[PDB]
Amino acid sequence: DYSATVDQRLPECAKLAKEGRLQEVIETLLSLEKQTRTASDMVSTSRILVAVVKMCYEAKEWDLLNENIMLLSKRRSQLKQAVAKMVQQCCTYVEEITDLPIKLRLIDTLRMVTEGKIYVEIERARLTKTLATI
């Protein structure tokens, strides 16, 4: 049930964000993420989180992306592995980013998100290496 509903919602909401970026898709996906988080479905939550960061990235969102990453990370009882996929997606995103100010801003946001979490330790280490290289 959850797999079907998430795979049905993700393309429709992605399209709705694409032709307008109305951003109501963000709240719809947040409600679906809450449902899957309660149900403990892992792959679902992972897909919703990665798609949320996806669309926030294709949209030229230099602040909404950071805010949404923070809220998603600090939600009530999210799945550690789902947040792990989200952070991995954010790392492969920040890799291909110019514009030093927003580069550093997103790097710092990810560092703050993953300060002291074992499941994201390797990603934070690579992120710190990237920050030091910059």
Partner 1 sequence: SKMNLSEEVDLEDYVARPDKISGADINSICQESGMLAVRENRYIVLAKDFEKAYKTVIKKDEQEHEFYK
Q: Which residues contribute to the site for partner 1 (CB under 8 A)?
A: 80, 115-119, 121
Per the structure block, which two tokens stand in for 103? 């580069």
Per the structure block, which two tokens stand in for 35? 């449902």
Buried b (16+ CB within 10 A) or exposed e, 26-35: beebbebbeb
Q: Whole-number minimum distance, CB 98 to partner 1, in Å?
A: 32
Pick between residue 101 and residue 116 the one whose CB is nearest to partner 1: 116
Q: Whole-number minimum distance, CB 116 to partner 1, in Å?
A: 3
Pick between residue 80 and residue 126 the one whose CB is nearest to partner 1: 80
Per the structure block, which two tokens stand in for 119? 């499941």
Pick between residue 7 and residue 121 the one whose CB is nearest to partner 1: 121
Per the structure block, which two tokens stand in for 83? 């947040």
